[PDB]
Every structure is written in C-alpha cells, then in structure tokens.
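Predicting holo structure, chloride ion bound.
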Amino acid sequence: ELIVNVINGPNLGRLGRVYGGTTHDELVALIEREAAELGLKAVVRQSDSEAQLLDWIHQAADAAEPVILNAGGLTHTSVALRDACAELSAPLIEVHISNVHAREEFRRHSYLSPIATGVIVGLGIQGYLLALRYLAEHV
Amino acid sequence: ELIVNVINGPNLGRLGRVYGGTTHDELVALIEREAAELGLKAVVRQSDSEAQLLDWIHQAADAAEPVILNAGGLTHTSVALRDACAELSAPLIEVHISNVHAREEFRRHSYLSPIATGVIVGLGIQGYLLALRYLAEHV
Amino acid sequence: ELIVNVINGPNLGRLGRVYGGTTHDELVALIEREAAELGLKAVVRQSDSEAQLLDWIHQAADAAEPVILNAGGLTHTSVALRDACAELSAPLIEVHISNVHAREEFRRHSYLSPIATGVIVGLGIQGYLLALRYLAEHV
Amino acid sequence: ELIVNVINGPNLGRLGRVYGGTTHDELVALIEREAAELGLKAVVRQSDSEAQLLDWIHQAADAAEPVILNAGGLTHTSVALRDACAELSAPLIEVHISNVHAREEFRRHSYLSPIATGVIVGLGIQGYLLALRYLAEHV
Amino acid sequence: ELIVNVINGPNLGRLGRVYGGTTHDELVALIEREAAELGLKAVVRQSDSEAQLLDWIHQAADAAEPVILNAGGLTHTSVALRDACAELSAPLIEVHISNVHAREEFRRHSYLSPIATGVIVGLGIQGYLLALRYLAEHV
Amino acid sequence: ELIVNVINGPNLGRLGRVYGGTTHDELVALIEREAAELGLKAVVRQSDSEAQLLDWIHQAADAAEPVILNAGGLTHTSVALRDACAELSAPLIEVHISNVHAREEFRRHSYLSPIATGVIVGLGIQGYLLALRYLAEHV
Amino acid sequence: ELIVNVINGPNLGRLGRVYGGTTHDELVALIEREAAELGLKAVVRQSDSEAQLLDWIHQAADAAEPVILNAGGLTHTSVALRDACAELSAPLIEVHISNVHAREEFRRHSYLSPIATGVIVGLGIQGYLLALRYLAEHV
Amino acid sequence: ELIVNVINGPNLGRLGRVYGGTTHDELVALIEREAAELGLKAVVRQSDSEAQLLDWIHQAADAAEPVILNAGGLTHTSVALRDACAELSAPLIEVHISNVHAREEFRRHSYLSPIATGVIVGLGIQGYLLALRYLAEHV
Amino acid sequence: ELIVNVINGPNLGRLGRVYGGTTHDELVALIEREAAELGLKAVVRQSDSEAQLLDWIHQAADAAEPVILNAGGLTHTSVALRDACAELSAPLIEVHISNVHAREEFRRHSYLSPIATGVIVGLGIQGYLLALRYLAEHV
Amino acid sequence: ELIVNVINGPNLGRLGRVYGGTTHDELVALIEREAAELGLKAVVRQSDSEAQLLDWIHQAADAAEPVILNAGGLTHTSVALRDACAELSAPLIEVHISNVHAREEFRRHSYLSPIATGVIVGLGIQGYLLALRYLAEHV
Amino acid sequence: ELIVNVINGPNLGRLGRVYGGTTHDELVALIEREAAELGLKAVVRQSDSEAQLLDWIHQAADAAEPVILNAGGLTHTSVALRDACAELSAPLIEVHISNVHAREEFRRHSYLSPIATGVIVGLGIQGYLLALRYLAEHV
Amino acid sequence: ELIVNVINGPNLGRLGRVYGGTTHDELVALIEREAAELGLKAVVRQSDSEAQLLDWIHQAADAAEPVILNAGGLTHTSVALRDACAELSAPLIEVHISNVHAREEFRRHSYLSPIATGVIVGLGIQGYLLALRYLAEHV
Ligand SMILES: O=C(O)[C@]1(O)C=C[C@@H](O)[C@H](O)C1
Ligand SMILES: O=C(O)[C@]1(O)C=C[C@@H](O)[C@H](O)C1
Ligand SMILES: O=C(O)[C@]1(O)C=C[C@@H](O)[C@H](O)C1
Ligand SMILES: O=C(O)[C@]1(O)C=C[C@@H](O)[C@H](O)C1
Ligand SMILES: O=C(O)[C@]1(O)C=C[C@@H](O)[C@H](O)C1
Ligand SMILES: O=C(O)[C@]1(O)C=C[C@@H](O)[C@H](O)C1
Ligand SMILES: O=C(O)[C@]1(O)C=C[C@@H](O)[C@H](O)C1
Ligand SMILES: O=C(O)[C@]1(O)C=C[C@@H](O)[C@H](O)C1
Ligand SMILES: O=C(O)[C@]1(O)C=C[C@@H](O)[C@H](O)C1
Ligand SMILES: O=C(O)[C@]1(O)C=C[C@@H](O)[C@H](O)C1
Ligand SMILES: O=C(O)[C@]1(O)C=C[C@@H](O)[C@H](O)C1
Ligand SMILES: O=C(O)[C@]1(O)C=C[C@@H](O)[C@H](O)C1
Ligand SMILES: [Cl-]
Ligand SMILES: [Cl-]
Ligand SMILES: [Cl-]
Ligand SMILES: [Cl-]
Ligand SMILES: [Cl-]
Ligand SMILES: [Cl-]
Ligand SMILES: [Cl-]
Ligand SMILES: [Cl-]
Ligand SMILES: [Cl-]
Ligand SMILES: [Cl-]
Ligand SMILES: [Cl-]
Ligand SMILES: [Cl-]
Ligand SMILES: [Cl-]
Ligand SMILES: [Cl-]
Ligand SMILES: [Cl-]
Ligand SMILES: [Cl-]
Ligand SMILES: [Cl-]
Ligand SMILES: [Cl-]
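Done. Tokens:
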C-alpha cells in the first residue's frame, strides 16, 4: 500500500546542529519528495519521549503499515521499544545515520535488529531513502 | 567515476539452490542492469578462495574503485580480509542478504563493519542494488 | 488495610491484540471482582510512560500501600524504577504473565526481583489474582 | 483431574528448625486442607535423595499428573532433574519459599524455570497454596 | 559567564523522605545561596521524565552554559542522555550524592563519566556546592 | 580538628613535567594556602614507595586524622593500600587529577572507592582544594 | 579380555517412552547380541543413583575392565563421577544418544570427555554398538 | 545408496610423520577395504585448501551423498565450512582422530558439531571405520 | 565438648588404591588416636551418597557438634550440601588432602568455603589432624 | 632440619589494633614458644616492603629452609612474590588469619596457592601454629 | 646449518604501498644481504594462500630448517597454521612489523606464540634481521 | 646518542641460580661488550624495589635516553610502572627472557607492551643484545 511511517527517536530533532549538516525539517522534505517519486506516502515523526514513540509504533501495528525506525540511543537500551516493534506485521527497517560499528563497543548491540526485517547503517541520510525504495519494491 | 566492484565470497556461487531463490548469474544480470540505469559499470566477481578475494580487493585499492562486499562466512572470521579492505580509499559497503542478527549469536560480529563505510543486512538481493544507488549518489 | 495498587507498564495496554487473549479492561474487571471477594480494594493503573509509573509508585510509598507490579520491558532495563520501588514499606509483588525464563536470555534478569517481596511468572493473568490473595492473607 | 503432586527436595524436611517457623508436617497439613477446599487431592512427598525425587517425577509423567516442585539446592545444579521434569505433559509449577533473587548470585539461575509452566518465589509457604489454586482453575 | 544549570533526574524530587534528610527545595535554596556568594546564577531543575531532561540539556548546548548533572538511575542506563550531554561545549560535572561504588556492582558504571569533565561522588549534598565552585574558578 | 593529610602516590612527584603544568611544590603551596583560609592545617606528602605510603596511612589511622589520597597507579592494583585505608576512622577522599573514565578501561576500576567516603575525578588540581573544603564543612 | 561394562545414568531407564523409540531392555538385548558377535561379554547396568553409578565404576577400576558410559545429565554436573572414572586403567568411552551440541549451550560441556579415551555423540543407540567394536579391536 | 565421501582437511596429508603412525595412503586403503566389506563405496579425498574442501562438500550436497568429515583446524575456525556442510541433506559425521577435549581449551568448540548428525572423537583411525558402519546401517 | 564429626564424601572410601597411600581405615585409626590424645572423641563416617552425607550434617546441626568435612567432588557442585552445612552452629572445617589450587581451574571454587569457619588444603592426611587440634583449642 | 621462616607481609605489623586482638609481638612469642615445643627454631619477620619480602624469600631459597607465608594483600596482586616463592625447594605453607572466602570476591584468588605445598585460611592465629606442626612432622 | 626460511603471509606482498615504506622486494634484498653477512642462506617466500603457506611450513618440518614467520592476519585466526608450525623441530621465530599490542584488542592474541621459540613485535623490518641473528648464534 | 639504559626488575638479580644458567653479572658483561662493539654505552641496573625502578625510568625520561626494560613480574601487575614508561620520549624495548606465551595464561598480558616501541620474548639473554642492535640502527 501507499503509506510508510518514518519514526525518529531521541535527539534526532537536533540533526544539523557524526550525523552531518542536514536538519530534521530538510530530512522530512527529502523523504517526502523521494516517497512521492516512488508512489508512496511518507509520514515522518520525531520524539524524545519513549511513550510517544511506543504510541506511534502501536498505531502502525494496528494499521499494518511498514516502519523505518531510527531509535537513536534507545536502540541499545529499550526492551519496551523492541516488544512493541515485534508486533508489527509489515516490514520494519532499522536505520542508523552513523556507522555504529566504528564507535563505542556498546553501540554494536541492537535490541531491535533481531526483530527487524533489515538494517541499514553508516550510509548517512540516504539510508532512509534507500529503506523507502526497498519498501516500494516489496509490495 | 563509473566503476564499482561487487565481490561475493565463499558459498555465494550456490545462491538459489535463508538466501532465497535467485541464482548467482541472475544476481549478476540484476546488478549490471541497475548499474547501467545509474550510469555506472558493475564488475561482479565471486570466489570460495580467500586469496582470490584478497587479490580482487588489492586491485580495487590500487585503482581507487569502490567495493560492495558480501564476504559470506569470512565476515566473522578473517582478519586478513579486514586488513586488505582497510586499504581501500573509496567507499566499502558491506552487504548481507540474510538478517545476520536473527540467527546465531556468532553472526552478530563482523570484522568488516568497523572499517566499512556502511552496512546493509536482511534486505535480500535488493541490498546490492541499494548499495549501488548509494555509490551513484556519492560521486 | 483494604487498598492494593496494581500497576502495569509499557505495552500492557495492548493485551489481547505470549500474553494471551484477555484485554486490559477485562483484566481490570477480573482484578476488581477478585479483590472485592477478598475484602480489598484494587486500584489498577497502566502507562507506557516511565515518569507516570514512578509517580504512581511514589504515591504508594507515601501512603504505605502494597503494589503488584508488571513493569513490562522496564523490568530488565530501569534502575530508576527499581530505586522508587525500593522505598515502598508495604509488600511489592513482581508479576509477569509469560514465563520470562523460556524466552530470550536477556529476560531472565530483573532489576526488580532483588527488592520485591516475591515474584510470580508464567501463570498468565491469574498471577495477578494470586498476588492479590497473598496480600489479603498478609494483613 | 483431582490429583496434584507436591514434591520437596533436599533439606526441606528440616523446615521450621530464611524459610520460616512452619514444619514440614504443618506444611503437609496446610496443603491437604487447601486442596480439599479446592476439590483436589494433594500428595505431598519430600526426599534428600535425587534418585527418589526422579522416581516421583517419573511416576507423575506416566500418570499425566501436575507437579508443584520445590527442588531446594538441586534447582541450581541438577540437569538430571530438569530432564525428568521436561517429560511431564501436565503443568509444572516451580516453587521457592525464599526470594532466591535477594540472596547469592548463584541462586538467581534455575535449570528448572525454562521448562516449568510458571514460577513462584518469595511468597513463603503460601506459594504452595497459590500454586494449587492455579492448577484448580486450570482444569 | 554567570549562569549554571543544575539538573536532577528521576526520584531526586523525593530527597529527604542513602541520600540524607535535606529536601529538594532546601537543596535548591542551598545552591542558589552558594551561587550568589560565588558571583554565578544557578538555575536548578528536576524531572522524572527523560524527555524533559533531554530538553533542558539541549537548551544548555544551544546556550553554551555549563551543567551540573545528577541523573539518578539514568546514569547507568541511558545512552540517549549521554548523547545529548556529549553536545555540551561548556563543562559538565556529574554529581552523585551517595557513594555509587559502595553499593551494587551495577552502580559502578556510568554512561556519563566518559564524556563529563569531572565526577563527584559520595560527598552528599555538598558535592553540588563543590561543583559550583569548580565552575566559578574555571571562567 | 585542624589537621588534614594529603598523600600522593607514585609519579606525582613529576607533576608539571593529562595532569597539567603545575608542579608538585606549587601544588603543596596551593593546598597549604587554601587550608589556612579554611582554618585547617594541611600536611602534604608524596612517595613512589608503597611501604612509605602505608606508613603514612597507618599514622593517620592511629591519630584519627582525615586523608585526601591520590594513589596514582596503585589505585587500580593495590589491595594492601586498600586494607590500610579501610582502618581510617576519619573521612577518606579519593582524588584523581585526570578523568580516569575517559581513558583506558582498566582505569575505570578503583580498589579504593568502595572504602572511601567520596571520590573526585577530572577536576584537575582544584579537586584537592575541593576535598579540603568538604572536610572543613564536615567537623 | 572378554568383559565390557555398559553403564547408563539417570533417566535412561525411561528410554522409549530426542532419545528415540527403543526401550532400555531392547537396548540391553541389542548390546548383548553385538557383544557375542564380537567375542566379548557385555554387562549392562542402569541407575538414577549417583552413588550406585560410582560403585559400578569403582568395581571396573579394581577389575581393570573397560567402561562405555552414558552418564545422562551427570555428564555436565558431576565432579565426583569424573574423579571415579579417572581411576579406570582400561578404556572409557563416553556415549551420548542425542547430539548434545545441537541443544542447549550447557550440554556442550562434559566433565567426562577430558578423561575419557573417546566420545561418541548423536549416532543414536548404535553409538553403544560402535563403542563395543572399538574395544574388541583394541585388545 | 553405495557412496560415501570421506573428506580430510589441512595437515591430514602428513599423518604418520597425537594422530598416530598410520599414513594417509594407509588410511585410504583401510577405509576402502572396510567400505567394500560393508557394501559401500568410499571416495576418500584430502586438501589443505579450504576452497577445495568447499567444492567437495558442494558436490556431496548436490548428489545427496553422506560425508564423514575431519576438518582439522578448520573445525574450530571456519564459518564458511559450516555453512556449506549445513546444505547436506544426507548424514554428516564429524570425525577427530585425537581427543580434542584432552587438549587446549580452544579445541573443545566446533563450528561443525551443531549441524552434524553425530561426532566421533579420540577413537583414532578406527573412528572413520565406525562412522562408515553407522552409515551402512542407516540406509 | 568432646565430640567431633569427621565426614568424608564420595570416593574417599578408595583412599590408598594425588591423595597418597594411606587407606580410609588407616585414616580412621589415625584420627581416633589423635583425638584421644587431645581429649576429644572422633566419629568418622564416609559415604558416596549425598543424601547420607546430608543426614549426618543434619544430625550435627541438631546436636550442635563441630564437623571436619572433606566433601570430595561435591565441594565444587552441591548447593544442597552447602545449605545443610550453613545450619551448623559449631565450627565447620573444610578439609582437602590435595592442593585443589594446583589442579584444574574448576577445583579452585568451593560452595563450602564461604560458610566454613576455615579451610585446610594440600597438607595431606595431616590436615584432618590439624583440624582436630584447632577444635580442641577452641572449646 | 630445625629452622622455619615465618614471613608476614604488609599491614600485619598492625595486628591487634577481622584479624583479632593479638599483636604482632604476641604472635612472634606464641610461634617461638610452639616451635621450641616442636623441636624447631622459628625466625619470624614482617615487612610492608615487597622488596624486603623478596629478599627474605630469596634467602630461604638459597638455604633450602621452609617458609610459612602470610603475604597480606600481595596474595592477590603480586606475580613477583609468586615467582620468588616458586624457587623454594622446601615446603611453603600459605597462611591467612581470616577466611578470605567469606569476604570480597577478589580475595578468593591467590597467586600463591598454585605453587604452595598447602594453604590454611580462617583458623585465626592458630593457623601459624598448625603450619608449624605440619613442618615438624614432615622432616 | 646454513638455511633459514622466511615466510610472509597474506597482504605482506603489498608492503610499502603501520608497516612502513619498504617494499617486499626491498625486504627480500635486505634479508639476503644480512644472511650472507651472517654465514646463512635465506629463502624468503610470501603468499596470500593459507594452503601455500602450509606447504612451505611442511617442507621446513621435513628438512628440519628454522622458520621466521610473519603470518599477517592468520596469526590471530588460523589453528591449521598453528598445527603445522607445531611440527617444526628447528626454531620458529614469530615476527610482526607493527606493535600488535598498540592496536585493536583482537591483535593481542596469537595462535602462534605458544608454540614459537620466541616473538619479535614492533621493531619494524629490522625484526626480521634480528631474528636472523638469533638463529646464526643458535647453531 | 651513545647511552642506553638496561633496567631489570624483581628477581632478575637471581639469574643463573626457565631463565637459563647465565648470572646477572655475566649478563652485564655481555651487554657492555656488545654495546661497545655497536658504538653505544650501556648502563645496566637491577632492583627488586618498584620505587627504585621508577626513579631510574624517571631519569631516562628527563635525559631523553632509550630504555631496554625487563620488568619481571611487574610486567603483568604495575600501572605505576606503565605510567612512568609512558613519559619516555626515546624508544622503549620490552624484553622477556622466557616465552611468556608458553606459560600461564596470566603472563600473556603486559601493561607495558601498548606503550613500548617493541617487544622481544623467548629469545633468552640474546634478546637484550638484539634490542641493543635495534637502538644502534635507530639513531
Ligand atoms: O543515527 C545514528 O547514527 C544513531 O542511531 C543515533 C544516535 C545513537 O545513539 C545511535 O548509536 C546511532
Ligand atoms: O549474505 C548473507 O546473509 C551472509 O553474508 C552469507 C553467508 C553467512 O556466513 C553470513 O553469516 C551471512
Ligand atoms: O508480562 C510479561 O510476561 C512481561 O513482563 C511483559 C513484557 C516483557 O517485556 C517482559 O519480558 C515480560
Ligand atoms: O525454598 C527455597 O527458598 C529454596 O528453594 C530452598 C533451598 C535453596 O537451595 C534454594 O536456593 C531456595
Ligand atoms: O545521587 C545518587 O547517589 C544517585 O545518583 C541517585 C540515584 C541512583 O540511581 C544512583 O545510583 C546514585
Ligand atoms: O591523578 C590522576 O589522574 C591519576 O590518579 C594518576 C595516575 C594514574 O595512574 C591514575 O589512573 C589517575
Ligand atoms: O544420551 C544422551 O543424549 C544424553 O547423555 C542423555 C541425557 C542428557 O542429560 C545428556 O545431555 C545427553
Ligand atoms: O583429527 C584430529 O584429532 C583433529 O581434527 C586434527 C587436527 C586438529 O586441528 C583438531 O583439533 C583435531
Ligand atoms: O581431598 C581432596 O583433595 C579432594 O577434596 C578430593 C576429591 C576432589 O574432588 C576435590 O577436588 C579434592
Ligand atoms: O591474614 C589475612 O586474613 C589476610 O591474608 C590479610 C590481609 C588481606 O589482604 C588478605 O586478603 C587476608
Ligand atoms: O607485521 C604485522 O605487524 C602484522 O603481522 C601484519 C598484519 C596484521 O594482521 C597483524 O596483526 C600484524
Ligand atoms: O624474563 C622473563 O621471562 C620474565 O619477564 C621474568 C619474570 C616473569 O615474571 C615474567 O613473566 C617473564
Ligand atoms: Cl538481542
Ligand atoms: Cl572488530
Ligand atoms: Cl549491522
Ligand atoms: Cl540486580
Ligand atoms: Cl523468577
Ligand atoms: Cl537453563
Ligand atoms: Cl561507557
Ligand atoms: Cl573493589
Ligand atoms: Cl568515580
Ligand atoms: Cl573439564
Ligand atoms: Cl557453534
Ligand atoms: Cl564431542
Ligand atoms: Cl560461593
Ligand atoms: Cl594463579
Ligand atoms: Cl583455600
Ligand atoms: Cl593459544
Ligand atoms: Cl593494557
Ligand atoms: Cl608479544
């Protein structure tokens, strides 16, 4: 179907001021533009609140919509986020802008990867665009 | 520039008979077709021999050409492969067809990821295509 | 005394749609019915927000009321939740609907168990009812 | 059906002289009284001999009768006990009188929990009674 | 410059009812009094909400103001908090009222210490005052 | 009372030629000046000899005088130093000039912290001055 | 010489009702038949009692007779069994019916293998027969 | 069917000059002789080249022929070898001439055992013969 | 008082045929002779049965008699033995004939030492005699 | 022969003001008295200096005299002390006054025990006397 | 005798374009020149193929010639290489050009060092020359 | 320049009575002779006192003279020694006479290697001579 949810977690609202010079609004505009090219509709949301993130994931579970998720630090710490993402019946693509394996050791474990469909790391902001293209070819 | 090397390691010659139903020749034809669309030239090679893989990586180092590398099992075991890939001055994108984080614990460490530019896992054969598209936008 | 607090953490609002087919409202009605049978009053609350959970625990600490707590994923990750529960002077019973020891290894550690009075796991929704009955016999 | 086996392992014969002031005979009389209230028949047995415990578990496997098991120290050490309990087709409820998570680190692993239906810890002698009530509601 | 942010995390609102008999309002009044003595202005804030804490840290990053941070339990669990604190360009002093090394083993790791300027533990409420004095000598 | 012992361990005699540009004699003069301001007497001693350090600690134990201790490398290696410091009945403040948590992993464990009153790290030479001020307020 | 002891440990009396459909008596009859073919005499014994197993091993030590040993769960837990088997001067062949390496991680360590002559796992009941044939060729 | 592949890995060409006095050609002649006795045909191959080993395993996968494999050092290091052996649909028997559990700790883990049918260790060269006999009884 | 229990666990009945050339009866006669010299009565018992050992320990707990215990392999494996020994109100001296620290790594942990009064290892059979002499001076 | 060296390491000079109320001089007088009873000569020495301890051990190595050694904290930290003690050709008995296994985890490893003849822990000051008696019976 | 084998493993053919500016041919010429000075003959070989390396080691084993070996990445990964080197009866000197202990943690373990005569690391290309000089003095 | 410091740590004064038959004075005479051949001056010092070793290292730091250091046991235990050696601006060569990797596991970690220029192990006393020759070629 058309709709794809792009969910960013804590601190991703500060993009542009490791993660590069593009701002979160620029990111939204890039995503929406690529999604229209692809025949999808992208709904892009960001929150520093875990409960707010869980609500958005819950809604994608009930609507059976795919999710492209950059959980930020919660990647490495939240079992609650993992359990909500485990209910999604449509694909889940875990995105990271930086290469989490070229940093601290503790960033090289994700609670999320074992239940995601796939993972894209280190490809910068284009990683989101590439995740979108995967989803457009997989319907 | 135009040229991109796609290097597959041991056992990837057997694709199609976890990794899906597409054969290695089909993979080559998909890659070459997408690369022409993108304005690149893809040189796709596969070997079960580590020394053969090292030679191909060496040549990409000397020519300063990017590499999209699916090292297979060597991902988790070869320091020699890592050291040769560390000499590449152009981007290196680590690809895995399956989600290595939804399998055995020992597949969740890569010698390669810390020196790659980025990593794509679990997106099937499309992961190669997406890696190509990253490289076409990054020249 | 009469009052018992039943606190559910993140994702437990979604019960019924591992954790079984009963909904969170059904759970509330089962608990309140069993508590009246037992001569207690049950106050049942659920939140995906850690701060909201901490507030409820704080209030039970100040009122010296017992707590039956199913913290969900926070069980395995929150030191903050643990520290607030450590102030309770009345009993704390840790409940889990599923058997956390028949799942992933990371679910077999609880920040909570060392400061709880006791723990009930794998007995489904009845675990809450049984926790209530323990508290009715222990006043 | 009516019958429930309550099996205590080594040292539980010494109850009453961490584990509280009730004796093993008092425990038997409490259990039998609660089981009659519930419409069940409780057969309560205790042994310091692992082979004797294995025989009792074997017999519950062949008769398809549920077991409430407090294995004492064997909880943390016996793979043999685990393997016999794994054959039970009726529910197995692991009971501990003390909170094993508020003690030594080595008491926080059980060979038994991964194959039990559920686990009750730290609720004192009432834990047995509560296990019985779970079984009476689950037939 | 004059301004110093003092940020307390979850449960620190309950001070006074390990952490001693002074209340959070008393703490605020002590800090403000010492800061005026020193020629600074202290802005003291407390929240049980991680997102609220992240917002305050974000604002100190944008204003280039120093932070004295007692994150409570989040010290040991939050990568998100760490990443926001890593953006601060002015000093960050990690404070703990209790000696975290004389307690549970899990309190002896901090996500925060590697990116802080310095750390003060076990000196009670005076630790905040001493952190202030460090900052007044370092401008 | 008036007297405070400031004990520096191996290599701290070389300060000034990570640890900054102030010399050990300058440090002594700074400490003595701040201690007089505070109404105390500071006795500052440095040795590369563990036995010499143990003797000084022994004497503070017998006199019931507080100690501010920067043990240098011995922090991470000496159980003997720990055991002598455990006899002190007056406060012990562990000081480190550098942030030991922003360095090698092996510097992030101290034999000393669990028996100290408190710990100050990364605040440079001022850490000693701040430790003094804690002791002047705590008599 | 002619005699070979075949010793089965706890739970192996229940064979036939992972370990397959053959019963312990059938196993005995298969072994005795193969041993006669080979010119040996097989003495096959089974016990759920560790002390009973130790006695049988002791007797093989004093008689200098080889042992084919399937210790069941005791494989992974008993140092006492290991020490008695270490006295055997004739060969000891450790047998397991299932593949212990395709199961839980804890089954992949044996106290016995380092002192055995050799080990056969995963070959079902034939493993015993093959162990016998090894011993008939090694006299 | 008749055919069984016996594959030896690196260094096994040097047998006879821990592993005993029989040469690799003697081993081949022993195997072929026992296989004819059993009504099978044994094809025995040895290589120090991992790629050569992978090719032989690939061919057994395509022909659906059983494999008796002594991978030598590759046992403990190769994920590539493991993945090729995982495709075999006929039985795989892992053989080791020495007892790998009476040696260095690092020899007590095999990448191969979890996907083999069964494993024979420490029975010398007879282990191959016994593996053959297992396969002759299992068709 | 006069009576001292000397309890030997599994395999110690075989002394004399690492542990030296003295037999268990010789050991008994040496102990009884030294105990009479010392004004005590020694009751020396040995069993390969854990339940039998637990019974003897239970009886020493009820009589408030000291125990000198060489548990053999059970030292390193039994939590049940530990828990029964923890009830003894008179001294418990753990004896080992061999030096358990000059052997396998797994012999360097004892479940028993943390609850014993003291431990004697590597002094051969004299260790028992020395334990007796400690008890004669400690009444 | 007659002579026995009793060597105490750091902090043991402070005995009497865990380790009990006897002073180091009292200890010396007790030892010398027991040694004369036994027909030996005891030379008792104590130092907080590792080099001084090494010299004394060196001299016992050259004279081939036994050593009873309580190294204090150095037990757990010094490889240098271990290597010098490894040269002794006469017996070495490691003594500890307290039970090192009922304390911190880090006290339960000794660099010394693997090269000692034997070890006595937790028997208080009598442990020295008992070590002497072992040596008098072993010449 | 005169002959010394110098064996370089994978990637060492690329020297000169961490490892410095000298090329592999320059290295060969330096070695041969120093070996003639010393009265030896140096045979210097390099391969990226493990099987090729094993063959060269095999030949040195059969000829009883010493080996100076820089295995590159295989140092840290190959058990096969280790086992072939373990057959050498003449000295084996492990050489590394860089300091492997000032790099990643995984480079600080060698499969080779425990069976080598000696190891030289971090001395650059001169390390080979120094290894030669050791061998010339040791015949 | 001409001068090279050769520093030996604890127990190396006892050479000659694992480490071979040459005495420390013989070692000094060998070193001085080789150093004169090379055009250097060797100053060779040995101490069992860590403080004495630190003083010598300090002096080499201030004079900018190279150091060849065999720290003995302190290699594996001293952070203080490491920190003083880290100040040296001229090369530091870590020498060990024995192969520390063919011994106990605990000898295979050095605090020193990560800050040394290079390391020579297992080449006996010649290792010192070879270290000298490295330094003569590196000025
Ligand atoms: O987009 C990223 O690279 C990242 O997910 C963002 C924040 C961090 O906490 C993650 O480690 C990486
Ligand atoms: O493409 C893959 O999924 C993989 O790289 C292939 C072979 C395996 O050894 C890797 O673990 C995953
Ligand atoms: O109720 C349960 O079973 C659970 O507490 C709920 C959510 C999960 O995160 C816990 O692991 C188990
Ligand atoms: O009932 C109990 O609390 C326990 O099962 C009894 C004996 C101990 O060994 C277990 O750890 C706890
Ligand atoms: O101030 C403190 O001591 C602390 O930061 C407060 C709450 C706890 O979670 C930390 O461990 C310590
Ligand atoms: O003052 C310091 O920062 C330190 O205590 C000095 C020397 C080092 O060994 C400690 O790690 C830190
Ligand atoms: O025969 C077997 O497969 C086994 O020895 C029997 C019982 C289990 O406890 C062992 O893990 C395997
Ligand atoms: O046959 C053997 O015993 C072995 O497989 C051969 C070579 C070694 O690397 C294995 O550890 C054992
Ligand atoms: O007496 C002994 O040395 C020992 O207790 C006896 C049997 C073994 O299992 C223990 O490790 C040591
Ligand atoms: O005698 C003792 O108990 C001890 O050896 C003395 C000092 C401590 O450092 C040891 O841990 C125990
Ligand atoms: O020569 C060296 O420094 C090295 O052996 C070469 C390649 C790397 O893989 C080793 O870690 C070091
Ligand atoms: O020279 C040596 O081999 C050594 O440095 C000397 C003493 C020991 O403590 C080191 O482990 C090795
Ligand atoms: Cl996970
Ligand atoms: Cl890595
Ligand atoms: Cl990844
Ligand atoms: Cl915990
Ligand atoms: Cl539990
Ligand atoms: Cl388990
Ligand atoms: Cl960290
Ligand atoms: Cl500690
Ligand atoms: Cl700290
Ligand atoms: Cl073992
Ligand atoms: Cl595995
Ligand atoms: Cl095995
Ligand atoms: Cl323990
Ligand atoms: Cl050790
Ligand atoms: Cl001990
Ligand atoms: Cl190794
Ligand atoms: Cl290090
Ligand atoms: Cl090394």
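The radius of gyration of chain D is 14 Å.
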